[PDB]
Scaffold this active site. Structure first.
Site, PDB file in Angstrom:
ATOM      1  CE1 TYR A 132     -15.914  -0.544  -6.203  1.00  0.00           C
ATOM      2  CE2 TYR A 132     -15.119  -1.914  -8.015  1.00  0.00           C
ATOM      3  CZ  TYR A 132     -16.006  -0.971  -7.515  1.00  0.00           C
ATOM      4  OH  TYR A 132     -16.982  -0.443  -8.320  1.00  0.00           O
ATOM      5  CB  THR A 168      -0.933  -0.015   1.209  1.00  0.00           C
ATOM      6  OG1 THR A 168      -1.560  -1.302   1.303  1.00  0.00           O
ATOM      7  CG2 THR A 168      -2.000   1.058   1.067  1.00  0.00           C
ATOM      8  CB  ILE A 221       4.870  -4.707   7.399  1.00  0.00           C
ATOM      9  CG1 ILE A 221       5.417  -6.128   7.212  1.00  0.00           C
ATOM     10  CG2 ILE A 221       4.900  -3.989   6.060  1.00  0.00           C
ATOM     11  CD1 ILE A 221       4.549  -7.024   6.354  1.00  0.00           C
ATOM     12  NE  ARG A 248      -5.026   3.100   3.376  1.00  0.00           N
ATOM     13  CZ  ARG A 248      -4.656   3.951   2.425  1.00  0.00           C
ATOM     14  NH1 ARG A 248      -4.693   3.573   1.154  1.00  0.00           N
ATOM     15  NH2 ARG A 248      -4.258   5.177   2.741  1.00  0.00           N
ATOM     16  CE  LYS A 285       1.220  -3.930   6.569  1.00  0.00           C
ATOM     17  NZ  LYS A 285       1.438  -3.373   5.275  1.00  0.00           N
TER      18      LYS A 285
HETATM   19 MG    MG Z   1      -3.907   5.503   6.008  1.00  0.00          MG
END
Ligand code: MG
Ligand code: LYS
Ligand code: LYS
Ligand code: LYS
Ligand code: LYS
Ligand code: MG
Ligand code: MG
Ligand code: MG
Ligand code: MG
Ligand code: MG
Lengths: 296, 296, 296, 296
Positions: free
Chosen positions: A109, A45, A205, A140, A164
């Site tokens: 999505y 990301t 991470i 997200r 993660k």
């Molecule tokens: Mg953010």
């Protein structure tokens, strides 16, 4: 199980003239290696995976592999996609091109069900013979890999070795390690690195490590050595930067910070990502002066 | 401003043997045409845009354009992406190949800022000369197009004429049409089709219309004719199917319903999408029995 | 079922030297009567029910009844409590002292189950023989009266005739009136009064009507007469004030506005409620300037 | 600053024929004393604060005070209210009747602003000279005491010494102790007792400890001695019961567990609280088998 743990960095992807700055990318990776980092994650990301082409995505995986060669630093290549055939393609590339393992974000999505997430990750895990780390970031993706699905994938597929976690849900991190203590729980949320590590987490991470790799390295290694007082002190020390690096959507603040520290030439993103507001620009600048930032 | 309004269908994308069933796609589109539809949206969220290659995506736009030739039915092509260069490429493809307009989903996963969303959509709108409809679905993307951003884009770009709202936020639909009554508010949530139309909304982009195109057609046109009693009557009858079509992640239920109705040969998704659970399978089957489903 | 519908006001409770200004209370109610209001709600959320004693609570019901005797205006007395024995006591007082019905908020803080909510309201409804209106506001109570529970309570107890919905969930408002079209759905959220009325809602219990009772009554009556164009017109005109009245928690803005209009002596609350910030004070002052505020 | 820390229990309130079973209350408290508990909290949320009269609320504080005299177990009396004059009255009562400190929940239902919460708690803190522990539980109150507000109250009022957090927000717990490490952070969420203690939290106010006081006691003390591996083991062992005790709204499950364990005569509960569903009754029963439950 084969694993990849310790202090890890979600590498930013520097741009120049709309193209991946391949020289600066390699430069940034060797700066991480020189500051105690155990592994690097190209094109997560934080690496703007969404706006890189499939070819650029692959280019940044190869640069990470080449730069880490001859060292103890592992490469956990970002290989996620919301299309399973796309994620499988990325996983097989990373295996064939020398990555130590892959990170695979939950499909964004298209919201697959838990059953769909299982089949998504089982196809991925069966695509390669290298360790696979799940990556849950529901804010997200719009989806969550339930604790039961994570545990089932860990137990049913040999190369899935952990997750993660970027959910801000310490209950889930207790849930995971109380019911399946063999998994590698990885912090994907810098502000709560110490609490997750204190509960049996085995690495991070990090977004902050892009700017302060030595501090995140020390924090993680103190914690893994069960020096919880020193791990907590650095975690508390880092809180202000850890949160200011999310005043706007990651990686907008961290790339602004790397630019302000002179670690990248230009503050360039790919649309729809953009420069921060001037107010947040000033807030990032103001948190930074209170930390010592290593150069090259 | 040029506009595309009325009753519209987010087309499922029938596959067969892992490939797009182009013959079934054309049949299903003309079935929408035969049942009062004013517009079709190829490869939206409901069409599994995420798991189609860019080729397939483009193929389904051309089939829709081809199938609507000789009728009033416009083609509002799904052209969204979380990468602006991808969204511009899709927009230019839809323009060059005969689409009447484009739908452009808010960038998912990388959650751009409001400024980033503005520049994302301005690049899209300036790439073509056909109408562009914004598409806000924060539950799938992780981002929201604020009311001010939508209004700024409506006022700053000539071909941006409205938004497809799939947020379940009737407050926001009042906000939008109270401050900018010239915009075309489009319902992207079947269960609240009538309330959005009742407040000045000018059409729907429906999931239910895949199965019951005649009923969604009638509902929208009654509302546009200001026969609010009849629009509400249809909205109330459809509530049960409108909600059960989201028992699991869209388009898993609607494709399940089309299969059970014998409207598609195969119960096919592309991973990470999958067949529904057996319990939800039966629950979809049981809601269908109270509705009369048109054939071809 | 006997019902209390139309335009209704959640009356503010003015204070003077920490005591209920009983003279101002009567004046404000009389002003509501003079501007087309159909019923008044003494001691709702807007009336600071939490910080009134049980006797002050009872005093304000008595003033409302007395001030409304001989006029069109009904009294729907706030009688809710998170303790069922407390809610039963208030309901019986309102019955014994001439209130036309009661409003009863869902129990706050202790989050009862759906079965608990049924028994809570069944105890209340059986304590009296006057209409009882449920009140759902989960952002403040921490619990929701499910759609099934509301309908069961409506069908099982004669005097439960509807619900005051303050949930910002237009889907839920379609859910209720599609499965039980006989109940009285009442808007408890001013910004979306019209959409709720457009879908078959039969009244509002308004916060804005404290300041602009003429506009809220007219909006309601246009809608009830199915003049949807004029009802929507007022709803859109009122959006800015409807929202600015929640820049801080209700009833802090409405009391600020009432004070700004010269409608109450002083801007007094009972702790933990307080005067607004200097920003919100000026923002409220200025949105009011766009509306004409009726006097006494 | 004087403080009240260690393992603490939010005492259930047993009822019998609708009355507070005062003999059972004393027995239950003495069972806590004999099982390593450092403090008891009469009439918290778990004590059904909402449905006790002000008189019974006061009765249960005095019983707790009387039962703990001659032992080291302190009494942290529940004294919260959404009305400041009500909260001040309870605080003064607890001070005058021998309580060692007070817990005071954030005002529920009426959602005060941050400025109001400051004045609410400052009025409480100045009414007495005994320690005051803030209590943040936004899922029940509808408001949250922000980190800045908590820190301002701790530094500005002598007797405000910490906060009982029941928010499921480990980020906030890092925020609190990184910016104000002198405060006493208290876990109000059993499932994550160890992570909060791991980060410098200094105690718990537990629901599970009603049933398993020895285990919650042992966990706390191990953690306080920085033996995290034994504290984490107990926390992990307790996860299943820690979550099942919230299958329904607390204290419905814990009172079911106490009744199933033969520690209270009747499964009473005061409306709108109710006995759990049949299934959840069986689920709690089941989960209980995995723990050794002490008698009197
Ligand atoms: Mg953010
Ligand atoms: N924009 C698409 C394609 C990415 C190309 C490789 N990362 C996505 O976010 O999945
Ligand atoms: N899976 C990628 C690429 C899709 C390309 C065609 N829609 C995405 O969802 O953005
Ligand atoms: N503050 C308490 C008492 C209110 C009594 C009069 N309304 C409550 O909100 O339940
Ligand atoms: N049920 C009311 C009154 C309780 C007063 C005694 N605790 C409340 O929770 O506020
Ligand atoms: Mg060592
Ligand atoms: Mg393919
Ligand atoms: Mg699109
Ligand atoms: Mg609690
Ligand atoms: Mg010791």
């Amino acid at each position: 199980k084969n694993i990849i743990i310790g202090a890890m960095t979600a590498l930013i992807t520097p741009f120049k003239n709309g193209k991946v700055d391949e020289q600066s990318y390699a430069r940034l990776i060797k700066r991480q290696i020189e500051n105690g980092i155990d592994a690097v994650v190209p094109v997560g990301t934080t690496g703007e995976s969404a706006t890189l082409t499939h070819e650029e995505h692959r280019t940044c995986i190869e640069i990470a592999v080449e730069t880490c060669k001859g060292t103890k630093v592992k490469v956990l290549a970002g290989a996620g996609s919301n299309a399973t055939h796309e994620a499988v393609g990325l996983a097989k590339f990373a295996k064939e091109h020398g990555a130590d393992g892959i990170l695979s974000v939950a499909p964004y999505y298209n919201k697959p069900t838990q059953q769909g997430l299982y089949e998504h990750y089982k196809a991925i895990a069966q695509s390669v013979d290298i360790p696979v780390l799940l990556y849950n970031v529901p804010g997200r993706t719009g989806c969550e890999i339930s604790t039961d699905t994570i545990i089932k994938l860990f137990r049913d597929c040999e190369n899935i070795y952990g997750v993660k976690e970027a959910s801000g849900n310490i209950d889930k991190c207790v849930d995971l390690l109380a019911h399946e203590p063999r998994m590698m729980l990885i912090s994907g949320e810098d502000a709560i690195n110490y609490p997750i590590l204190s509960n049996g987490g085995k690495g991070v991470i990090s977004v902050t490590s892009n700017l302060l790799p030595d501090m995140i390295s020390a924090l993680t290694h103190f914690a893994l050595d069960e020096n919880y007082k020193e791990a907590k002190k650095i975690n508390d020390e880092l809180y202000n930067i850890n949160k200011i690096l999310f005043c706007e959507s990651n990686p907008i603040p961290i790339k602004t910070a790397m630019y302000l520290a002179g670690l990248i030439e230009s503050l360039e993103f790919r649309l729809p990502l953009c420069s921060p507001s001037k107010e947040n620009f000033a807030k990032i600048e103001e948190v930074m002066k209170k930390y010592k930032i290593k150069g090259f």
